[PDB]
Structure formats: C-alpha cells, structure tokens
Ligand SMILES: NC(=O)c1ccc[n+]([C@@H]2O[C@H](COP(=O)([O-])OP(=O)(O)OC[C@H]3O[C@@H](n4cnc5c(N)ncnc54)[C@H](O)[C@@H]3O)[C@@H](O)[C@H]2O)c1
C-alpha cells in the first residue's frame with residue numbers, strides 16, 4: 002500500500018549497511034502495508050559524512066555560502082511538488098499514522114506554506130549580512146556575519162510526520178545548513194517521499210539526507226555524532242533528557258521541543274457550544290496526539306454541569322472510522338504500543354478513583370485497529386497520574402474551579418509549560434490569564450491554531466528554544482562579529498623598546 | 500586589606516550556614532589578605548528561594564513584570580556607584596586577581612558602560628512588547644510578549660572578576676529576571692562590593708543574590724538546582740561539560756562561554772612594530788589569562804625572523820611588577836595552582852622539542868609572587884600540547900606559514916572556536932580570512948577589543964550561544980505568543996449534535 006524506498010544519502014537511494022528493515026503497520030487494520038530501512042550507526046556516519054562534504058564542497062558556493070535567493074528556489078520548488086503530490090501524500094500520511102484524511106490534507110498545505118515562508122526568510126538573509134554595529138569609539142568598526150551553523154541533526158516525532166520534518170528542514174536549509182533527518186520509525190513514509198521530491202527537484206547532493214530507523218539505533222548515534230554541529234529535537238520529555246545528556250560531552254548545542262500537559266480555562270461567561278468545540282478540538286484532534294493538547298480542562302463551577310453534558314453530546318457525535326473514509330473526525334491511534342499506554346493511563350485513573358464520564362472503551366463498530374472512543378475523565382484529583390502525565394490519546398481530564406486565582410494556580414500546577422488557553426467574554430480577564438499562565442503559547446477563545454508566522458516552544462519540562470516565526474532561521478545560523486581597528490596610530494598600550 | 504563581607508541573600512548580609520571561609524590570597528605577596536564565605540548547597544538553596552520569592556512577589560509587578568524603564572533606573576544607579584567607587588574597586592581588583600591597575604581601571608569603566616548599555620536595552624524592551632504578528636487568516640490575531648525566563652544562575656570566572664559578573668547580571672536584570680551569582684573562589688572581592696552597591700541603591704530584596712564558594716560546593720548545586728530556570732556559564736571546556744550534564748535531567752537551558760586557542764594570522768605586508776604590539780596584547784594582557792587570547796601566532800615565512808626579533812625586543816621591555824606599582828604592564832598570575840599549571844605547560848613544551856625564544860622563567864628581580872616572564876615559544880609542531888591546549892599564562896606559540904590555504908588550515912586546526920585575528924595591508928585578504936576562520940569573533944588589524952555593543956561567543960569546544968550586543972537581553976527572555984480567534988462564527992470542524 003506504501004512505496005518501497007531506501008535511505009537517502011548523498012542525493013542517491015542507499016540500502017541500509019546491515020540490510021535490516023522495519024514494518025509499516027496500518028493502525029486501522031493492524032496489518033503490515035510495507036517496510037522502511039532499519040538504519041544503524043554506519044548509515045548515520047555515511048549521512049553525516051555526506052552532509053559534511055556537501056557543506057564544504059567548492060568553498061560552499063553551491064549551497065552553504067551561496068546567496069539565499071539560490072536556496073529559496075529549491076525551497077519554493079519542493080513546496081510546488083508537495084502541492085502537486087497532495088492527494089497521494091495526504092493518503093500515505095493517513096495510512097502510516099492514522100490521522101483523518103482532512104487533517105492530513107491540512108498538514109500538506111502547511112508543509113508547502115512552511116517551505117514558502119522559509120524561502121522568503123532565505124532571501125531576507127542576504128539583506129541581513131554584514132549588518133553594521135555602531136561602536137562608541139571612532140577608531141573601530143564592526144559588522145555581523147550570519148553563517149550556517151553547519152551539519153544539523155534533525156530528530157522528529159510521528160504525529161505530523163512530514164510537517165514536523167518540514168519545521169526543521171525548511172529553516173535549516175534556508176540558513177544554508179546541510180542536514181541529516183531521523184524521522185520517527187512509526188511514520189517514515191512521507192519523509193522518504195520528500196527525499197524523492199528532492200531528487201526530482203535536483204536539490205544538491207548531500208544537502209538533505211534521510212536515515213530511517215529505531216530511536217536507539219539511528220537517533221542516538223546522530224544525537225551523539227562528533228561531526229554534527231547542532232541537534233534540533235522534537236519528542237517526549239523522557240527522550241529530551243537523553244538528547245541533552247548525549248550532547249554534554251561535546252558541549253554541542255541542542256533545541257528541545259518536548260511534551261506538555263496544557264490547561265484550558267473556561268469561564269462561566271461563554272457561548273457553551275463554541276467553548277465545547279474548542280475544548281474537544283484541543284484534546285481530540287490529531288487523535289489526541291497533540292503536543293500542545295489542552296488536556297486539562299478547568300471549568301467554572303457555575304456552568305460545569307451543563308458544559309460536561311454538552312461535551313459528552315458533541316464527543317459521542319464525533320465520527321470515528323478508517324481515516325480514509327468520508328467525514329472521518331477521529332481515526333485510530335498510531336500503534337499498538339501507544340494504544341496499550343493509553344489503555345494503562347485510563348485503567349490507572351479508574352484505580353485512583355476518577356470517573357469515566359464517556360469513552361474509555363473501543364467504539365462498538367470497530368473490532369480491529371487501535372481505536373479508542375473520545376474519553377472524558379471527571380472527579381480528578383491533582384495528585385493523580387492522569388492530571389500529571391502526558392497521555393497522548395483522545396483523553397480529557399476535568400477539574401472545576403470557582404475563582405480566577407484557583408484557575409491560575411491549577412493551570413500552572415504542572416511541571417510542563419508548552420501551551421495554554423483561556424475562554425471568556427471578559428477581555429480584561431483573558432489578558433490577565435495570558436500573562437499569568439506559564440507557557441510558550443496562550444490561545445484566547447480557541448485552542449490549537451499554530452501559525453508558521455509565530456515562534457513555537459515550551460518552558461520547564463516542555464524544553465527550551467523557539468522554532469518558526471521571524472527568528473526561526475536564526476536557530477540554524479551562527480553570528481560572527483568582524484571588528485576592525487581603522488586608526489593608523491599604534492595601539493600605545495605597551496612601551497616601544499625603540 | 501580587603502573588606503570582610505558575608506553572602507548576599509534577600510537584601511541581607513548572611514554568614515554561610517556551615518560558617519566556613521576561604522582565604523583571599525594576594526598573588527603579588529602570596530599572603531592571605533582577607534576571607535570570603537565558603538558557601539554550600541544550603542546557602543545556594545536560600546539564595547534560589549529568595550530569587551524565586553522576589554520574581555513572584557506582588558504578581559511580579561515590582562520587578563519581573565514592571566516596565567523596563569523602572570529596572571533601567573536601578574541599572575543606571577549601580578553604574579553611577581561603580582564610577583563613584585572606581586579607584587577603590589580597581590585597587591581591590593588588582594589585589595584580588597593580580598591584573599595591573601590600569602587594566603582593572605579599564606574594567607571598572609567597562610562595568611559601568613555595560614550597566615548603561617543594558618539600562619537602554621531594558622527601555623527598548625518596553626517598545627518591543629505586544630508586537631503584532633501578521634497571519635494568513637483574518638479570523639485570528641497574534642501578538643508577542645517577551646517575559647523574563649525567571650530565576651537565573653550566573654557562574655563566572657576570576658579573569659575579569661566584576662566585569663564577567665556584570666556581563667550576566669546587567670542583561671538578566673534588564674530582562675526582569677531575578678538572579679543568583681556564583682563568582683570564582685579565586686576572585687570574589689569586587690563581586691561582594693557589588694552586593695554593597697545594590698543595597699546602597701535600594702535594589703529590591705531577592706533580585707540579586709551572591710553566594711561565594713568552591714566550584715563543586717556552591718557552583719554545582721546552583722547549576723543543578725530544580726528552581727533555577729536557566730544557567731549562564733563562563734569557564735573552562737572541562738567545567739562546561741559538567742554544567743551541561745548537570746542541566747540535562749531537568750532539560751534546563753544553559754549558555755556556555757568556554758575556553759579557546761584562538762589564532763592570529765600576520766601576513767608579510769604589515770607594519771612590523773604595530774602588528775607586534777597587537778600580537779603581544781593578544782597573548783600577554785590580563786597576564787595572559789584571556790579567554791579569547793590569540794595564543795597561536797601564524798606568521799608569514801618572509802617576515803618571521805624579523806617579527807620574532809621585534810617581539811622579543813618589545814616583550815623584554817614590558818614592566819613586570821606589583822600591579823599597584825606605576826607603569827605595571829604585567830602582574831603575577833592569579834594563584835599558585837595556575838602558576839604551577841603554566842610552569843608545567845612551559846616544561847612540557849621544552850620536553851616536546853620546542854624552543855623557548857624568551858621568558859619561560861620567573862623574573863630575577865621578584866623573589867615572591869606568582870610572576871612569570873612574557874614567554875614566546877617557537878619551532879612548534881601541531882602535535883605539541885602547547886599548540887592544542889589553553890595555557891592561560893603570558894605564553895605565545897609561533898608557527899610559520901608560506902601560503903594562505905596553509906595559514907587557514909593551521910588557523911582552523913583546533914577543537915576550539917572562540918575568536919581569531921588577521922593582520923594584513925591587503926583588505927580583500929583580510930575579508931577572506933574573516934570568512935574562513937571558524938570563530939565567534941574575528942579582529943582585523945588588531946586583537947582583543949571587546950565591545951558590549953557586539954555579540955560574543957564561541958563555536959565547538961568554546962561552547963554555544965552569544966552574550967552582549969542587541970540580542971544579549973534575549974538570552975534572559977522567553978517569548979510567549981498570544982493567539983486569539985476573533986471570528987463570531989463557530990470553529991466548524993466537528994458537527995453539532997442534531998441526530999435523533
Ligand atoms: N513542538 C513540540 O514541542 C512537539 C511537537 C510534536 C510532538 N511533541 C512531543 O513528541 C512526543 C511524541 O513523539 P514520539 O513518540 O515520536 O517521541 P519520542 O521522544 O519517543 O521520539 C521522537 C524521536 O526521537 C527518536 N528517539 C527515540 N529515542 C531516542 C534516543 N534514545 N536517542 C535519540 N533519538 C531517539 C525517535 O526515533 C523519534 O524519531 C510527545 O511527548 C509530544 O508532546 C512535541
């Protein structure tokens with residue numbers, strides 16, 4: 002059902018050194034629909050060697066030190082190809098990761114949009130070169146150079162397979178870096194198709210290299226590679242710790258875009274059905290596999306009863322089916338491992354004394370696949386595992402509040418800090434919550450809309466740094482000051498012996 | 500001679516919890532001239548707790564979330580007191596770390612300059628708040644808020660005691676952070692005087708806290724503290740690895756400003772005496788204890804012989820003495836441990852077959868103190884320890900080159916990448932070298948001028964990140980996007996329940 006591709010190293014299709022493979026499991030049927038290479042340390046070494054050789058080739062005039070206008074042409078051309086292959090790519094995305102077709106089509110528009118946005122950033126880089134720095138001494142002059150950081154290691158998750166890859170590839174390429182992409186072993190199909198798009202577009206050999214494989218066998222040697230200049234990582238807090246620990250012996254820079262347990266605070270002065278839809282979107286869209294999921298609902302006590310009943314009616318109305326089926330609004334979760342973890346979180350919540358308001362069972366009409374009904378859990382306590390840990394399934398927990406200070410304390414009662422949301426008709430209250438909730442992104446009267454134009458990132462256990470936005474390219478650039486002594490006078494610090 | 504201070508926690512002078520002290524060793528006389536608190540994990544905990552309580556007090560309205568213009572007044576008040584106390588601070592700096600008085604005096608001007616630059620940055624921050632972001636959908640609006648990252652841990656070295664502390668304190672405070680400074684156990688005197696200035700200017704309690712002590716006893720608990728939001732570190736590559744490994748289980752962000760082995764490339768088309776002075780300044784000033792030291796001279800074969808002869812004439816003319824003595828141009832090195840480490844680098848070079856062109860011994864006229872003559876080592880080989888490793892003494896190594904490709908390969912033949920320099924009458928050649936040398940700072944026709952207006956940092960084993968410059972305040976700020984749905988239409992992704 003999916004293409005049979007190899008690893009992409011030095012602009013050519015390369016089989017894995019050890020000849021091992023991993024299955025492509027369809028989450029709707031539980032069947033193997035293909036295979037991806039099982040990359041190892043030798044394959045990573047080859048991809049890093051190719052990225053290194055491409056960066057230094059012809060003093061870097063073919064890519065790295067070439068004008069931004071040149072790299073922008075390949076970026077815009079990759080975006081044109083993704084739009085051209087949109088139905089096949091969205092279908093492969095739904096087949097590989099389980100997300101509804103409508104979500105996967107949205108993802109493909111954003112992939113091209115992100116390549117387009119960063120092509121403009123590459124052209125904007127030329128104007129930023131040799132930027133003067135005003136000094137307090139007329140005897141000196143200063144200018145800034147913004148050079149590619151070098152060979153970058155890009156490690157991504159399975160929840161937006163091609164989009165997560167694009168978030169790192171598009172700015173890294175725009176900056177003039179050469180890269181090694183290690184996408185998730187759970188969803189590598191569309192990334193291998195991007196490799197085909199690059200080959201088809203004639204992207205210079207070795208500029209983008211793709212090594213598929215298991216986290217410990219392909220990800221870990223890439224993260225710890227002595228010849229990788231920077232690691233840009235997106236994944237769990239658990240893996241983020243290993244990524245930073247692997248970089249420490251080489252004082253190697255990293256960016257960490259990790260998990261979350263984001264809150265949504267819904268006040269009593271809302272349009273109930275509008276607030277309910279955004280709460281369901283904030284926890285159930287992407288099949289609940291949202292890094293920024295507003296997975297803790299903080300609902301005002303005055304409307305809680307009515308709100309909870311409206312949520313259950315909307316949740317029970319969500320069409321759960323094969324992601325390729327018309328009108329699908331909930332697909333299966335990515336894999337068996339993920340499904341079992343979500344099952345365990347749900348049973349632990351029941352054991353701890355929580356109430357399953359709705360869901361927490363397989364949908365009646367779907368005997369096969371990693372299908373889970375939209376789940377709402379009430380009578381939650383702050384000490385429960387379900388309140389503290391990232392579930393990564395369509396599982397929402399609910400806590401009531403009576404005052405604005407109780408809501409802010411409960412919203413910040415997390416060791417994470419990726420995102421947050423506030424729903425209220427009171428504008429001044431929305432302003433207060435936007436200031437007081439500790440997170441990289443606060444939504445007002447919504448939850449989840451993520452624009453390429455704005456910086457994205459977490460605080461605390463959600464990691465550090467910001468990706469995307471007008472500073473997105475700067476993650477892959479190194480600043481060099483060039484300071485010149487322009488006086489013909491001797492320095493005059495030391496006494497001349499003559 | 501030095502003042503007797505305690506730790507500075509929550510606006511108070513606080514003795515260390517375990518009551519232990521560390522001597523203040525005068526490097527000129529080798530004698531104990533005072534004592535500093537030997538802080539431990541309990542003292543670090545109290546400092547972090549005070550910074551956290553100050554950040555959160557009154558919803559951050561009096562500091563963290565106050566306008567940048569309010570914090571700017573305190574940064575300007577600190578700068579004015581530094582100038583007011585300049586001769587006494589410069590004298591204490593020379594007594595504590597060993598640098599000549601004229602250098603210590605320059606550092607105090609740079610301390611005040613840095614606080615003034617960051618006060619302007621705090622006022623500029625107010626203009627940057629709530630910045631709009633244009634979106635490709637009219638149903639949404641987006642603005643950016645730049646908030647303090649929170650409680651920050653600032654760990655610094657002894658080579659520019661008050662200035663290194665200032666490089667981190669000024670932008671952190673400008674951003675609205677609260678901080679805990681852990682300065683070096685070898686030079687804590689002026690940093691403790693900064694705490695006295697903070698008290699004098701009425702800095703709100705807990706905003707700045709200072710815990711002195713040994714690196715493993717005070718530095719390490721700070722770097723690994725669960726309530727520290729970010730660690731800004733300056734020190735060796737050896738320590739930098741520990742800082743980053745300590746932060747990893749908490750996914751705690753860090754910036755690392757580490758060591759270097761920076762090259763200076765001198766072409767034949769140069770005024771000899773002018774290139775010589777900059778070469779010596781790039782390796783011997785700060786008594787050779789320069790992170791960005793151009794410790795590797797790459798000299799063109801056509802002028803190498805005359806260049807070495809002129810370097811020896813200038814070096815032998817440097818007045819080596821007590822840093823408080825008029826005309827001092829080279830003081831002793833900071834400590835006995837450093838003095839011994841430098842002597843070992845010189846003997847290992849001699850043992851490895853290198854030539855001691857000049858110096859390499861203690862001055863005959865100075866019986867006491869950690870004094871080492873200006874040293875130049877020639878007939879170097881790239882396998883030698885002296886080529887590879889940071890010496891941190893007034894010790895220069897010399898390599899000859901005949902081609903530009905050879906000079907570039909040699910310049911980049913290091914696992915460091917802090918800085919570099921090129922000296923040549925050919926401007927196009929100077930530009931080629933500025934592009935090819937892999938480092939954060941390239942000086943042209945000079946070596947060492949460091950302006951707080953410009954970003955500063957290293958590549959490779961020299962660390963990552965940039966301090967100072969227009970982006971310096973951003974190391975202490977965390978961006979928050981505020982994205983609002985402005986449409987009166989329902990989202991319309993899911994279907995409203997209407998089924999029978
Ligand atoms: N923008 C963001 O902050 C963002 C976006 C999407 C997802 N996420 C987070 O990602 C997680 C879900 O993704 P996942 O299950 O793929 O996460 P994961 O941490 O298990 O793996 C992510 C990637 O890291 C690799 N990896 C795993 N172990 C590794 C190791 N030891 N060394 C190096 N690489 C290794 C994996 O193969 C994969 O490519 C969630 O926690 C989610 O919140 C964050």
Ligand SMILES: NC(=O)c1ccc[n+]([C@@H]2O[C@H](COP(=O)([O-])OP(=O)(O)OC[C@H]3O[C@@H](n4cnc5c(N)ncnc54)[C@H](O)[C@@H]3O)[C@@H](O)[C@H]2O)c1
Pocket residue numbers: 654655656657658681682683684712713714715717718719722733734735736738739741742755756757758759789790791889891917956957
């Ligand atoms: N801008 C820069 O890149 C820059 C500037 C100046 C100095 N330096 C570097 O600094 C070094 C000289 O300074 P130093 O001898 O004080 O360096 P150091 O690394 O030994 O110590 C620096 C600071 O870290 C503390 N520290 C030591 N061990 C620690 C540990 N285990 N955990 C936490 N903190 C610990 C020390 O007490 C001190 O405050 C040189 O390598 C020099 O190149 C770099």
Ligand code: NA
Pocket residue numbers: 025026027096097098187188189335
């Ligand atoms: Na899959």
Ligand code: NA
Pocket residue numbers: 523524525594595596685686687
């Ligand atoms: Na001292």
